[PDB]
Design a protein around this ligand. Structure first.
Ligand SMILES: [Cl-]
Ligand SMILES: [Zn+2]
Lengths: 21, 30
């Protein structure tokens, strides 16, 4: 999940964009 | 744009900015 993707590892705003409705 | 460790409310802050009007789902249970 996003916590694993973005907190535990790193991520871009594009990766974050995948979680918008 | 660059990578960065986003944690706790900073993640949701990021999401808000990125998504804005589209809205978002925050689901740490995955
Ligand atoms: Cl913190
Ligand atoms: Zn903080």
């Amino acid at each position: 999940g996003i916590v694993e993707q973005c907190c535990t590892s790193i991520c871009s705003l594009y990766q974050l964009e995948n979680y918008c409705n | 744009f660059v990578n960065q460790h986003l944690c706790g409310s900073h993640l949701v802050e990021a999401l808000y900015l990125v998504c804005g009007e589209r809205g978002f789902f925050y689901t740490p249970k995955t």
